[PDB]
Amino acid sequence: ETLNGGITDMLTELANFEKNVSQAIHKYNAYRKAASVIAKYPHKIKSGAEAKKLPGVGTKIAEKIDEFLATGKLRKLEKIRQDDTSSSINFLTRVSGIGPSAARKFVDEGIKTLEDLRKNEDKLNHHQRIGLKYFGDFEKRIPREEMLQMQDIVLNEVKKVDSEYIATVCGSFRRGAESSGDMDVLLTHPSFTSESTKQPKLLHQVVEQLQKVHFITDTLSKGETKFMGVCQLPSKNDEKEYPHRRIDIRLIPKDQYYCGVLYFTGSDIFNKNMRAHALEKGFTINEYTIRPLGVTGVAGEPLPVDSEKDIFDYIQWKYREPKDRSE
DNA sequence: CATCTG
DNA sequence: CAGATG
Ligand code: NA
Ligand code: NA
Predict the structure, then answer these.
(1) How far is CA A184 from CA A76, A130, A246, A264, A278, in A?
(2) Which positions in this protein are listed as binding K(+) 2?
(3) Catalytic (active site) residue A64
(4) Residues A249, A280: one domain?
(5) Which of A37, A77, A259, A323 has its CA 20 to 30 A from that of A252?
(6) In this structure, what DSSP letter does residue A163 have?
(7) How far is the CA of A46 from the C1' of C5 (A)?
(8) Phi, psi at residue A267, to the nearest 5°?
(9) Are residues A97 and A126 in the same domain?
(10) Distance from residue A31 (CA) to nucleotide B3 (C1'), in Å?
(11) Which residues of A does the annotation place in the binding site for Mg(2+)?
């Protein structure tokens, strides 16, 4: 956690690079199990040889550990941190819609900057175009004070369209958090579930109200159960308009809302432990359900949940206010 | 995993 | 349809 910190870090830089610049998924996956294991490792790694003794730890990595332990640096890392090509890829990638793959093509065609991108807006798709237009806004965290106003609007409009909708804002927002990255709304309806053959309108009507009032400003991706967009809190008595924020809305069959809601709410560490305890209690949980665990090895059959309560209950546990879902 | 692009 | 992004 701090005893093999640099090591785990260098490894991470390395891994990243394989994957992002090279197309070295193998190598890339190599650095990661390695950091993973050194990380768990109980002692202060004093040498490569020591490390090598570990699984995931080969001779090449051992080698690197040496030079780094031997000197506060690593040549390779040093070379990579310079390379403009490598830097461009790390950067373009910050644009929403641009992944590594696209980053390479772009660089190869000589686009390595923001300006580059504007010039060539033509070679970018809708998502990437939007992603460029709001580059700044998108990198700005969302203060809870805004979050409360967003949520305020969203719920009031879903309500109008149909009293029967059930919307929930998950995320760190929900675990208390002072600011957040984007807005994630879980949506359900009685008239939609596991069997029920669809209802696309279910999602579309809402998305539509939201734009009616101008809260949603653009669409990144809109399918029949998941929508990726951009919204914006109306600028008041103009002087101060707000940044454009990322928002996502997803329709879930009512029969698996709470597991969804549970799940999306995190934190990751919370889930795990919860998942791990579920297991003890003779259960299983995932993003959509909790199932009784047979002894034959496994076994299923979705237990029925009416709230996040039902879930805890099941595994016979202490109902946790979202806030303490930290770990 | 669900959407989009080409 | 593969393949890419979130
Ligand atoms: Na990106
Ligand atoms: Na292939």
Answers:
(1) 40, 19, 9, 9, 26
(2) 93, 95, 98
(3) yes
(4) no
(5) A323
(6) T
(7) 41
(8) -70, 180
(9) yes
(10) 31
(11) 182, 184, 248
Task: Please enumerate, by residue number, every residue of A annotated as part of a binding site for K(+).
Answer: 52, 54, 57, 93, 95, 98
Q: What is the resolution of this structure in A?
A: 2.6
Q: Which domain, by its residues, includes A251? A: 141-263
Q: Is the C-alpha dihedral spanning A149, A153, A154, A159 positive or negative?
A: positive
A226, closest nucleotide (Cα–C1'): B2
The total number of structural domains in chain A stands at 4
Alpha carbon A245 to chain centroid, angstroms: 15
Nearest nt to the A228 alpha carbon by C1': C6
Residue A101 near residue A23, CB atoms below 8 Å: no
Q: Please name the method used to determine this structure.
A: X-ray
Tokens 């760190």 sit at which residue? A172
Give the active site residue among A27, A44, A64, A212.
A64
Q: Output the furthest CA–CA distance in chain A (Å, rounded).
A: 66
Q: What angle do CA A143, A244, A232 make, to 5 degrees?
A: 85
**Vertex A182 angle, CA A14 and A31, to 5°:** 15
